[PDB]
């Protein structure tokens, strides 16, 4: 139930993981993100040029997605972006931001121990971007000063040249979100570290798990934060007249309020200090819209409750995206019922009860062979057992067989699809959880029975590990012939 694409279709082959550049973020987006509001520009119920819309997805079931068009059920939701005036750290990379800042000194921004050291020579040649960065770190964490010059390897004296100014490098520590060190206090600003990575030599990236084009430390700390679209944070609830938005929408509002809380102090009434108090909260929200499980403070009220979610806890294991909605999806065409056992059945058989048979369906193409039985099936309809609902035509249009004017008729042409009830001897997957096996997952033959149980053979008791003490059991029905093969042959 979609459209038709001059663009070809293909399997996904490679997956590349990287980072976002200011260059991308600002050109990849279409939205601008100006106002911290959501809707109602002085009561005017629409979209607003603030957070939700200006060249992005809609809500009132409209094709007004900006030539994106067509239906919420099609537009993936571009995106826009939010111009952070003051540079802002990244949350999961606090560990590594430190780590790199413990590998590169100040002022010029250069590798601490070159090829001149005769231990670092076992790092610049080793394969893998992962173990290489674990090698370098071990050496340039003790040495502080950028060094004058400095050997000369190999040998006697006096010396050679390479370049650099010999300033001391601090002992960096973790303080919530800030990085502070001791020299022999000075806190390393976000503006201060971005400028260290805005330079840095080309062979300084590759040397430690990075890439010229894909991922840079100057991108690791966040210049311009991307704004996720609406289909990632839906709307109303129990009103249709009293809003009720999501929750990632609430946190982006907190950043947007804090972002134009600094520009109302830069080009407006400008205090000299205690303005760093506002730099913590604008960093804190991008540090909390991305993760909320570190150390210090959680979050709470509004227009909602507490604590918070913050992407990562949509990703984290179980009931989140990967392990809950990707690895193990919920699925259509399925059934569950309490099992009871039947000695007058055949081993591979499974008594599917009548009402479940009227529910579940298999799409069958109309082929000159089956018409005689298939048209009778249309005529019997979705009530009497050997029947069917839904008839699919040339142009993909849906005949609902349990309403409509022309349902006690329909002349079936060739190559039309007809979803039919399950009939006897169809091949169906029949499992019991907890599924410990292949053999808790066995195909079966169908015989439609009266009474509400799934009936099955006592000798198939063991591999599923079932009683009749009330064990319920699942049943899945294929939808392609190929699958129908791969069930009764494997």
């Amino acid at each position: 139930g979609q459209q038709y694409s001059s663009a070809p279709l293909r399997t996904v082959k490679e997956v590349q993981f990287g980072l976002f550049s200011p260059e991308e973020v600002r050109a990849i987006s279409v939205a601008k993100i100006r106002f911290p509001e959501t809707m109602d520009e002085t009561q005017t119920r629409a979209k607003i040029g603030g957070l939700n819309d200006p060249r992005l997805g809609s809500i009132d079931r409209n094709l007004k997605c900006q030539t994106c068009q067509e239906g919420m059920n099609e537009c993936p939701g571009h995106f826009g972006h939010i111009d952070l005036a003051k540079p802002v750290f990244h949350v999961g990379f606090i560990a590594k931001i430190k780590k790199v800042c413990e590998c590169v000194c100040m002022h010029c921004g250069k590798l601490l121990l070159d090829e001149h050291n005769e231990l670092m020579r076992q790092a610049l040649a080793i394969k893998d971007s992962k173990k290489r960065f674990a090698a370098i770190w071990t050496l340039c964490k003790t040495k502080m000063v950028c060094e004058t010059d400095v050997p000369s390897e190999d040998d006697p004296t006096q010396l050679v040249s390479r370049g650099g100014c010999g300033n001391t490098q601090p002992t960096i520590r973790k303080d919530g979100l800030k990085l502070v060190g001791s020299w022999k206090l000075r806190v390393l600003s976000t503006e201060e570290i971005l400028n260290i990575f805005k330079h840095i030599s080309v062979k300084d990236f590759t040397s430690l798990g990075f890439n010229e084009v894909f991922s840079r430390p100057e991108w690791m700390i966040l210049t311009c934060l991307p704004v996720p679209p609406p289909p990632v944070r839906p709307s109303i609830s129990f009103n249709e007249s009293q809003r009720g938005e999501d929750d990632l929408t609430f946190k982006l509002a907190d950043i947007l309020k804090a972002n134009i809380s600094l520009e109302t102090l830069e080009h407006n009434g400008a205090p000299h200090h205690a303005i760093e108090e506002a730099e913590s909260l604008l960093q804190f929200h991008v540090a909390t819209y991305m993760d909320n499980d570190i150390a210090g403070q959680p979050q709470a009220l509004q227009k909602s409750g507490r604590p918070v979610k913050s992407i990562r806890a949509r990703l984290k294991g179980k009931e989140g995206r990967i392990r809950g909605n990707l690895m193990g999806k919920r699925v259509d065409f399925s059934a569950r019922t309490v099992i009871s056992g039947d000695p007058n059945l055949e081993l591979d058989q499974v008594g599917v009860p009548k009402s479940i048979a009227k529910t579940l369906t298999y799409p069958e193409v109309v082929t000159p062979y089956n018409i005689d039985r298939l048209t009778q099936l249309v005529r019997n309809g979705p009530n009497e057992h050997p029947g069917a609902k839904y008839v699919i035509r040339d142009s993909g249009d849906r005949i609902d067989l349990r309403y409509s004017k022309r349902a006690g008729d329909i002349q079936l042409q060739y190559g039309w699809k007809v979803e039919r009830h399950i009939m006897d001897n169809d091949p169906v997957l029949f499992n019991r959880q907890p599924s410990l096996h292949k053999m808790s997952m066995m195909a079966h033959r169908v015989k439609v029975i009266p009474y509400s149980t799934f009936r099955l053979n006592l000798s198939v008791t063991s591999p599923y590990n079932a009683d009749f003490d009330g064990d319920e059991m699942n049943l899945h029905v294929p939808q392609s012939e190929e699958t129908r093969a791969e069930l009764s042959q494997l």
Binding site: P434, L436, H437, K438
Partner: protein
Amino acid sequence: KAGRLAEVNLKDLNNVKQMVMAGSKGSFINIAQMSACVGQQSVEGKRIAFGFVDRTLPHFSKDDYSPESKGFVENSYLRGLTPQEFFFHAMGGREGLIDTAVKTAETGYIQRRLVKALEDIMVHYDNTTRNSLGNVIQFIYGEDGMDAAHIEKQSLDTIGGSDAAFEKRYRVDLLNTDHTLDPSLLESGSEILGDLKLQVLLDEEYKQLVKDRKFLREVFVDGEANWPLPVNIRRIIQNAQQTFHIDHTKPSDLTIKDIVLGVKDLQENLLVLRGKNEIIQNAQRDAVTLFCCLLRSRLATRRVLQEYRLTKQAFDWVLSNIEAQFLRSVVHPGEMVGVLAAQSIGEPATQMTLKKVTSGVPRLKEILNVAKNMKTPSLTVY
């Protein structure tokens, strides 16, 4: 002992004994407890320990280590448990419920890890065994390239038996009127007597059978014959001497070559690895090796001709059958073993519920952690 007193008292019309005689439900403990006595209850290995510091219940004195005070139920479930007894029994039962709800918990953490550690491990095509990186694990799946589905337990006759009983069994000496094949066993037996071209082929057979016995005993130091091996030769043989209806009174029509150069040429046709280059065909040999012990083994001029007399028509079929069945037992390139191998260990793991060595799921928890902190360490010096 009380149990076995109740076991040899149950008459043959006694229904409980009959279900046990069937293997249908129940066992010896079930009998012992219902009819005789339920025995000594245990919590954390040790018999009921004191709560009330130096006594189990306040119905007893202190420092009383006798049987009833520390939780021995003298009566059976038919007779009735006593006030005390009942609480003791309760204490035991509760631990059962407790560890069950903690076993499956610990098992499903095992199972999931196993499944996730092996996963992408499948055969393919070069019949080896590898992951997504294409980092090889096994060069031949299960070291022999056989699916476990087909495989069966089969005694290796070469492994057991006396040096006196062995010759008797396998040696065919034509130059020896007391060790020849009787002219009643072979069509040519009397003419085959003597002969120096067929006593370099039989000496070729008997010498490989002895190289086999020294080779097997070096592998199976246990002395155990019975081992998992493809293709049930015993049943191909039972199929031979009932399909062709052979009388054990009239002599075979086989030649000594038919047998000896038969088995040696079938051996060539038991393909597993196929590559025509030096290294592959060298591993081809090093995969059939055990199954070729076993087929010689079995079959053995003396075996074929004296133990289960076979005709040339039947024997050619048997040889044809073994090659046929053998090619069916090979793993199918594509078999996902990752999962299959995890599932096969994680399943009985779930079926463990309760003598000093750590065992059960708790131990298995160490093994799969590569634990430095292992509960029971032990040298076993010989």
